[PDB]
Amino acid sequence: TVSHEVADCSHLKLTQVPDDLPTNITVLNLTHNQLRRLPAANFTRYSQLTSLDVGFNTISKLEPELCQKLPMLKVLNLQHNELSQLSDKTFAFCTNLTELHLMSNSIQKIKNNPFVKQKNLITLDLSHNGLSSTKLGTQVQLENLQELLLSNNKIQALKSEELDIFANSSLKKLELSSNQIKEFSPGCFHAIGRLFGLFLNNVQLGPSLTEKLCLELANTSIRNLSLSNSQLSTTSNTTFLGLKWTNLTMLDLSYNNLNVVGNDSFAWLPQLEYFFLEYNNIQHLFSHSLHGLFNVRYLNLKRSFTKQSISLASLPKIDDFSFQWLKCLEHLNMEDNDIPGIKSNMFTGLINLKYLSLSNSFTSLRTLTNETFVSLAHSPLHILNLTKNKISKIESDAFSWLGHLEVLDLGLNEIGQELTGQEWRGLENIFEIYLSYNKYLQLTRNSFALVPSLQRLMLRRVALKNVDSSPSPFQPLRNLTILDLSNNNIANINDDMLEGLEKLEILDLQHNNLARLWKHANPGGPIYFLKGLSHLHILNLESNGFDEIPVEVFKDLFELKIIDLGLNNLNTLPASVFNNQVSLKSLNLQKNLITSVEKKVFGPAFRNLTELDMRFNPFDCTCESIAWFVNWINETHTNIPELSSHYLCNTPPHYHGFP
Amino acid sequence: TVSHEVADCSHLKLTQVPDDLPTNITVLNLTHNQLRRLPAANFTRYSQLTSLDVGFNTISKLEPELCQKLPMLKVLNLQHNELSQLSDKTFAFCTNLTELHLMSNSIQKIKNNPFVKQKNLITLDLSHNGLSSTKLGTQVQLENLQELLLSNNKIQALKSEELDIFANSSLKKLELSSNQIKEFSPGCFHAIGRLFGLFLNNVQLGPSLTEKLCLELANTSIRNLSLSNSQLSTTSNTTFLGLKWTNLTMLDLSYNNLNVVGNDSFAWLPQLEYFFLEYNNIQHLFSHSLHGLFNVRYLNLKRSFTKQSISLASLPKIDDFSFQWLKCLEHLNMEDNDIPGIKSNMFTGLINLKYLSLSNSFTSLRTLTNETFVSLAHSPLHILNLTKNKISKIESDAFSWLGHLEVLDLGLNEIGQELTGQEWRGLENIFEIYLSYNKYLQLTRNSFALVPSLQRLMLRRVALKNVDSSPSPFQPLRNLTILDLSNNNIANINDDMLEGLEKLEILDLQHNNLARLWKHANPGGPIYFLKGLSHLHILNLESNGFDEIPVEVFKDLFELKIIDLGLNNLNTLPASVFNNQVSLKSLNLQKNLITSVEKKVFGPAFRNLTELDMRFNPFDCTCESIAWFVNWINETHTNIPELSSHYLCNTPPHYHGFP
RNA sequence: CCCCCCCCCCCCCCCCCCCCCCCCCCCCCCCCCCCCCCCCCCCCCC
Ligand SMILES: *[C@@H]1O[C@H](CO)[C@@H](O[C@@H]2O[C@H](CO)[C@@H](O[C@@H]3O[C@H](CO[C@@H]4O[C@H](CO)[C@@H](O)[C@H](O)[C@@H]4O)[C@@H](O)[C@H](O)[C@@H]3O)[C@H](O)[C@H]2NC(C)=O)[C@H](O)[C@H]1NC(C)=O
Ligand SMILES: *[C@@H]1O[C@H](CO)[C@@H](O[C@@H]2O[C@H](CO)[C@@H](O[C@@H]3O[C@H](CO[C@@H]4O[C@H](CO)[C@@H](O)[C@H](O)[C@@H]4O)[C@@H](O)[C@H](O)[C@@H]3O)[C@H](O)[C@H]2NC(C)=O)[C@H](O)[C@H]1NC(C)=O
Ligand SMILES: *[C@@H]1O[C@H](CO)[C@@H](O[C@@H]2O[C@H](CO)[C@@H](O)[C@H](O)[C@H]2NC(C)=O)[C@H](O)[C@H]1NC(C)=O
Ligand SMILES: *[C@@H]1O[C@H](CO)[C@@H](O[C@@H]2O[C@H](CO)[C@@H](O)[C@H](O)[C@H]2NC(C)=O)[C@H](O)[C@H]1NC(C)=O
Ligand SMILES: *[C@@H]1O[C@H](CO)[C@@H](O[C@@H]2O[C@H](CO)[C@@H](O)[C@H](O)[C@H]2NC(C)=O)[C@H](O)[C@H]1NC(C)=O
Ligand SMILES: *[C@@H]1O[C@H](CO)[C@@H](O[C@@H]2O[C@H](CO)[C@@H](O)[C@H](O)[C@H]2NC(C)=O)[C@H](O)[C@H]1NC(C)=O
Ligand SMILES: *[C@@H]1O[C@H](CO)[C@@H](O[C@@H]2O[C@H](CO)[C@@H](O)[C@H](O)[C@H]2NC(C)=O)[C@H](O)[C@H]1NC(C)=O
Ligand SMILES: *[C@@H]1O[C@H](CO)[C@@H](O[C@@H]2O[C@H](CO)[C@@H](O)[C@H](O)[C@H]2NC(C)=O)[C@H](O)[C@H]1NC(C)=O
Ligand SMILES: *[C@@H]1O[C@H](CO)[C@@H](O[C@@H]2O[C@H](CO)[C@@H](O)[C@H](O)[C@H]2NC(C)=O)[C@H](O)[C@H]1NC(C)=O
Ligand SMILES: *[C@@H]1O[C@H](CO)[C@@H](O[C@@H]2O[C@H](CO)[C@@H](O)[C@H](O)[C@H]2NC(C)=O)[C@H](O)[C@H]1NC(C)=O
Ligand SMILES: *[C@@H]1O[C@H](CO)[C@@H](O)[C@H](O)[C@H]1NC(C)=O
Ligand SMILES: *[C@@H]1O[C@H](CO)[C@@H](O)[C@H](O)[C@H]1NC(C)=O
Ligand SMILES: *[C@@H]1O[C@H](CO)[C@@H](O)[C@H](O)[C@H]1NC(C)=O
Ligand SMILES: *[C@@H]1O[C@H](CO)[C@@H](O)[C@H](O)[C@H]1NC(C)=O
Ligand SMILES: *[C@@H]1O[C@H](CO)[C@@H](O)[C@H](O)[C@H]1NC(C)=O
Ligand SMILES: *[C@@H]1O[C@H](CO)[C@@H](O)[C@H](O)[C@H]1NC(C)=O
Ligand SMILES: *[C@@H]1O[C@H](CO)[C@@H](O)[C@H](O)[C@H]1NC(C)=O
Ligand SMILES: *[C@@H]1O[C@H](CO)[C@@H](O)[C@H](O)[C@H]1NC(C)=O
Ligand SMILES: *[C@@H]1O[C@H](CO)[C@@H](O)[C@H](O)[C@H]1NC(C)=O
Ligand SMILES: *[C@@H]1O[C@H](CO)[C@@H](O)[C@H](O)[C@H]1NC(C)=O
Secondary structure (H helix, E strand, C coil): CCECCEEECCCCCCCCCCCCCCCCCCEEECCCCCCCCCCHHHHCCCCCCCEEECCCCCCCCCCCHHHHCCCCCCEEECCCCCCCCCCCCCCCCCCCCCEEECCCCCCCCCCCCCCCCCCCCCEEECCCCCCCCCCCCCCCCCCCCCEEECCCCCCCCECCHHHHHHCCCEECEEECCCCCCCCECCCCCCCCCEECEEECCCCCCCHHHHHHHHHHCCCCCCCEEECCCCCCCECCCCCCHHHHHCCCCEEECCCCCCCECCCCCCCCCCCCCEEECCCCCECEECCCCCCCCCCCCEEECCCCECCCCCCCCCCCEECCCCCCCCCCCCCEECCCCCECCCCCCCCCCCCCCCEEECCCCECCCCEECCCHHHHHCCCCCCEEECCCCCCCEECCCCCCCCCCCCEEECCCCCCEEECCCHHHCCCCCCCEEECCCCCEEECCCCCCCCCCCCCEEECCCCCEECCCCCCCCCCCCCCCCEEECCCCCCCCCCCCCCCCCCCCCEEECCCCCCCHHHCCCCCCCCCCCCCCCCCCCEEECCCCCCCCCCCCCCCCCCCCCEEECCCCCCCCCCCCCCCCCCCCCEEECCCCCCCCCCHHHHCHHHCCCCEEECCCCCEECCCCCCHHHHHHHHCCCCECCCHHHHCCEEECHHHCCCC | CCECCEEECCCCCCCCCCCCCCCCCCEEECCCCCCCCCCHHHHCCCCCCCEEECCCCCCCCCCCHHHHCCCCCCEEECCCCCCCCCCCCCCCCCCCCCEEECCCCCCCCCCCCCCCCCCCCCEEECCCCCCCCCCCCCCCCCCCCCEEECCCCCCCCECCHHHHHHCCCEECEEECCCCCCCCECCCCCCCCCEECEEECCCCCCCHHHHHHHHHHCCCCCCCEEECCCCCCCECCCCCCHHHHHCCCCEEECCCCCCCECCCCCCCCCCCCCEEECCCCCECEECCCCCCCCCCCCEEECCCCECCCCCCCCCCCEECCCCCCCCCCCCCEECCCCCECCCCCCCCCCCCCCCEEECCCCECCCCEECCCHHHHHCCCCCCEEECCCCCCCEECCCCCCCCCCCCEEECCCCCCEEECCCHHHCCCCCCCEEECCCCCEEECCCCCCCCCCCCCEEECCCCCEECCCCCCCCCCCCCCCCEEECCCCCCCCCCCCCCCCCCCCCEEECCCCCCCHHHCCCCCCCCCCCCCCCCCCCEEECCCCCCCCCCCCCCCCCCCCCEEECCCCCCCCCCCCCCCCCCCCCEEECCCCCCCCCCHHHHCHHHCCCCEEECCCCCEECCCCCCHHHHHHHHCCCCECCCHHHHCCEEECHHHCCCC
């Protein structure tokens, strides 16, 4: 029963409440216990409780005396119990409750008036019960109740009389999910004082019943209406007629298996702002299908279209000018679809668009012709996502229409070509370009000469070729900050590749082959490709096969903080190498061949750190080579994980395995 | 000028012969020098010479006084000189010479009688000279001359008169290669006393001139006749008519670009025993093409047939019963051909065949149907070679016709299947089966149950699968001696896999993954799969990833001599492991992680060796761990290559790199 | 001045083989999570 300010007793197998706790405890948690009964006589000591979570237990019934001992209780949680009987005196003395959870209590019928005696209630939960009617009392009560949950019940109708108790209550959420509701009575929602949101997820309504619901929702204050998994196979221009008289803003139609969308179906939602259509089975989107939605600010179409079938090749076709109506659209999530391709008028009319996602949106967008993004000429796009589209070639002037583009995501594709440099023309405001996980890229002298504003360039596992050109391909990128060149099997790097990139901060070169470039036997001398990077912060050089470190590689990294050198073949290091790393924070040298840690090399590096990773190193336990290191280990504040588990000497055999 | 019994002065840039050598020297070699002249006055000291190789020098002329100082000279070599003038007195005093080389001396014309004064000459060489006629004198001499070489000369005719000097000489070899001979005179070869072999390689004869040659060779004692690269495009039944009256045994027709072979072409060679046809362009072999060769004991057909061409797909077709005439054939080398496949009557009639080679003989022999080798039912084959035939499947009873087969070579193929065990039925006398470098093989319990007589089984780089069956697939192979299982990436081995193989001698398991089977943390205990191999001699366990050696793995290898354990991860070894290796000869532990060599483990192993390979090991220079080893290195007779080059300690840094 | 034969030496090209390092893929084994399922035991409600 650990407790400092709140009390936790979760999964402690308690049968009776403890009697030894501070009197001024505010939260008392007893989830996942076996409390058969809860006598109130044991709550005399606990008279300052605010939250009482006694859920997931086996309480049969409660007593009104429990509330007497708690004068200021605000939360009462009784999830997954056997409290199937309620009375007027059950919640009589409790009047400050702002939360009441009764989920999965097997409550069958609300008898007379269990909730009359409280007026400050905010949230009421009745999910997973055996209730058949939404009647919670006779007179009007629950003045401040804002959220009412009735999901997973056995309610088959919504009669007008049963909601007469909410004539003056502002319901912000009426959860009625998973209830086989098949009849709606007139005035059922008009009787509710102020209904702001309705949720009918997993409710088998159907199109005709959906139209009846919308008609019953006319001239009300609804703002949200979730109809997920409602088996809404087909919509028409009259399905949402009843919403013409309201101001609905959020509509959810996900998982409805919507086979087709009718012409002018959504013309009755001029105030819609958030529209959801993910995980549907739409086979054809008409030009006027999305008519009347000129105020939508966020449209989701993830898996909204039909998948390809070898039987018929029923690829979902999107007609031209289909998105011309979404004037105020600002976010289009359109991932995991099977569209044949982009047309010249597919995205016409989106004059306020700022985010377009096309991750795996097309079956085969092999070539990015310069006319592909012509429909996005007037769209002020900022972020474009094109991952997993199996793109194989990008022609010149492909992105010449996206003048406002800032983030381009071309990773996880099959782009194999030579970057002539003309592919990035027109990206005058580009900031980040992602190209990782491609087939193979061949850089040129002027590959990135047309995008001087670039700041991020990720090229992880792309099999870079001709990166060792005499003019550095990264020279025009004066504002570059993050560069990733990992898992490219790079062999040769020139010393002037990173020349002029003063603002570079994060550089990744792990999982490459640069061992030869740093050995003293390399013809032409070791390559010092890390000079001038005065603002470098994070350096990664894992699995490079390094066997020797030149003395003056880190001579100018005055602001280096994180350096990674694990999975290398380092055995000895030059003396006085980390002198300029005055602000180093994390040093990683795991899975190396280092046998000696001396002050002459690791002195300045161990000045003020916060992490250290030298786990799988064959240390040599000798006072000449490890004594300073173990003495430093003894007194320090640096975090060294697995210090006593893997920091084991290998030689001499006398100290073989001794930490 | 190193010399103990013979004198060598090759490539020493001598200008004059040395005057300080033992008097009783028998061989005096001066090849590749710059001896402008060779005065005989310097040979007074050297009067016991038998061989005098002064070739590849710049001697202009010699003097008869040179022979006077040498009474017993037998070899006179003058290759690549400028001795273009010969006289009767040049070789007068020299009479014991049994060898005389005059290659590339730019000799223009033999004037009168340069070789009369000797009668014991055996071999005479005159290659790469400017001679235009084969006249070497006027009268008859050279009684004992057996070999005469005249290759690469400028002889354009073979007149009868020019060979009148060999009326009583037995010529075993008359080399006339690379001479543009275009006319043969009657009686040219009949004038020669006893001609046994003629060589006309690289001589542009042609079919009509070949027939004229054969007619001129009638009723003579020739036995060999090499006509390689003679531009013999076509043969007919009359090309070799002139050989009907002789007893020719060896005939060479290689590189002749023989496009077609005529019907009954070789019916005139009943005594032929060695026939060569390699590197030809035969497009079709007729049934009666090889008629009359019922005495051939060795036929070579390597690249004898035309290669495939995409223009016409002119695959060389071999008619049925084409080899029916070779009754006494015993060796058929038939590699590197483009035959479409094997037929039911391709090899019929070979009742004495004992060696058939079909390495890369067919373009695509994908499936080995049980009817493929039906033509070899009565052939007493012993060795069959089927490498690089791109064989993809072997059906049951494929080798049911080869009852006398002993060696089967199926390696370097693409055989991917499951060895049900019925493929080896009928191999009652099989000894060796080669299957290395295949696609993938899946062994079964009774894979080799039908060939208990097997002794060799090579399975290198075949990706063995299901080798860890509960019954050992090698159990029926009671007489197995050599087993190769390298580069198969084998993971799991049962301890009874090699049970009962007492006669096993050589076992290869390198380049596999058996590290887990020997660690003490392996569930079920370490696998001791080397028990009962009392006759094991060679063991290979390279690149297995071993990290720990069980103590009693080599407890029964009483006759082990060569053990390989290089490229492993061994760091420590159990004490008293090599006790039973009383006859160990070579121990290989290179490229390991061993840091300590102690008498407790390497004592018995270093008893009496002949080789040791521990080059790339990070030894720990400490008197507790290396002192015994270095003391043993000091005094020993074992061969330790690169002892002072790679046996360098890694730790402590004081001894870093010191041998 | 031309045509050739040798000695020595330095580059260049092709192929074979070996070694170091690395990448990708795959196999074997282990571990950490997530979901689902089955069984045993205890405690309650109807
Ligand atoms: C363009 O769209 C694509 C696709 O939507 C975006 O890719 C997404 O990028 C984010 C950020 O990198 C990814 O989130 C990551 O999720 C991984 C999940 O790994 C988990 O690891 C735990 C470990 O226990 C496992 O148990 C889990 O099962 C799981 O494997 C997480 O490790 C990362 O830290 C990170 O949060 C996201 O997954 C990825 N989407 C897809 C489909 O791959 C891309 O960012 C976007 N471009 C832009 C510019 O926004
Ligand atoms: C069925 O026929 C096949 C094909 O004729 C036979 O395969 C032959 O097998 C022999 C013996 O294994 C091979 O000889 C080997 O040749 C290699 C050559 O390697 C060399 O290495 C030097 C190293 O400096 C290089 O310079 C050279 O260039 C060359 O690469 C040699 O290393 C071995 O020691 C061995 O002598 C032969 O090459 C091989 N033939 C072919 C075409 O691969 C096969 O034996 C035969 N089956 C039976 C049962 O006879
Ligand atoms: C939906 O929104 C419209 C526009 O905001 C509301 O119409 C206004 O309502 C307010 C409050 O009753 C009136 O003061 C305005 O005069 C109305 N303007 C117009 C042009 O009608 C409408 O009431 C909202 N719907 C509901 C059900 O409240
Ligand atoms: C109607 O739905 C919208 C969209 O789900 C809700 O807006 C989000 O609400 C969640 C829950 O409070 C927040 O976490 C998000 O930040 C909201 N998004 C935005 C863009 O504001 C909205 O609250 C719902 N309205 C009602 C009355 O339930
Ligand atoms: C919704 O509007 C679109 C746009 O007009 C309709 O598409 C037309 O369908 C007819 C009938 O096949 C075609 O002849 C026209 O060529 C289509 N128009 C265009 C621009 O291609 C669509 O039919 C309408 N929906 C319904 C249900 O009628
Ligand atoms: C690289 O970044 C710098 C700094 O963000 C950019 O310089 C700014 O340019 C704008 C517009 O010309 C000026 O208003 C700012 O005053 C500049 N900042 C400074 C500190 O001088 C520069 O334009 C960027 N380079 C590119 C090619 O976009
Ligand atoms: C080729 O071989 C045959 C058979 O060996 C030779 O014929 C024999 O020659 C010897 C020697 O002259 C005689 O004694 C035999 O009587 C011959 N027998 C027959 C059946 O003819 C023949 O001479 C050989 N060819 C040459 C050119 O010598
Ligand atoms: C005729 O040719 C055959 C085949 O080349 C010769 O027999 C081989 O001769 C070489 C050279 O002496 C030997 O190394 C081989 O061992 C011989 N092979 C066999 C099977 O004996 C034969 O010597 C040649 N005959 C003449 C007279 O030159
Ligand atoms: C050499 O003998 C073979 C075997 O008879 C001849 O092959 C025959 O060729 C004729 C003409 O095309 C065909 O009609 C026969 O069917 C072939 N025989 C067989 C058994 O297939 C071959 O023609 C002869 N060589 C020459 C030059 O005539
Ligand atoms: C395995 O090898 C042994 C020895 O070579 C074979 O035993 C010989 O068999 C022959 C024929 O039956 C006998 O004449 C020998 O006396 C046997 N030798 C010994 C030492 O007993 C045995 O047959 C071979 N196994 C197979 C299946 O062929
Ligand atoms: C509750 O309902 C009564 C009767 O309609 C009404 O007078 C009162 O204003 C309502 N409560 C609130 C807080 O509006
Ligand atoms: C559906 O469209 C038709 C065609 O204009 C129209 O007559 C009808 O009124 C629409 N449905 C509703 C419910 O308005
Ligand atoms: C680039 O776009 C223009 C305008 O559509 C077009 O005329 C031209 O052919 C395109 N270039 C290429 C290489 O396709
Ligand atoms: C060194 O690290 C400690 C611990 O995080 C921190 O308190 C101190 O300020 C650091 N010193 C400097 C100069 O940053
Ligand atoms: C350092 O050593 C002292 C003396 O043994 C010990 O008291 C102290 O706990 C050690 N510090 C750490 C972090 O272990
Ligand atoms: C040399 O030729 C003569 C004349 O024909 C002959 O008598 C003599 O026997 C021959 N020499 C030998 C060794 O046969
Ligand atoms: C070639 O064959 C024909 C047909 O039998 C025959 O008449 C002729 O004699 C043969 N040639 C020779 C040189 O015998
Ligand atoms: C095996 O050979 C016999 C005889 O030619 C044939 O009848 C049978 O079909 C062959 N078996 C298979 C599986 O082809
Ligand atoms: C040990 O090796 C030496 C050297 O080869 C050899 O002379 C000697 O006979 C060997 N001893 C035995 C018992 O084989
Ligand atoms: C062994 O050491 C002795 C003493 O230094 C030396 O004379 C002898 O040459 C050494 N043996 C070898 C094989 O180097």
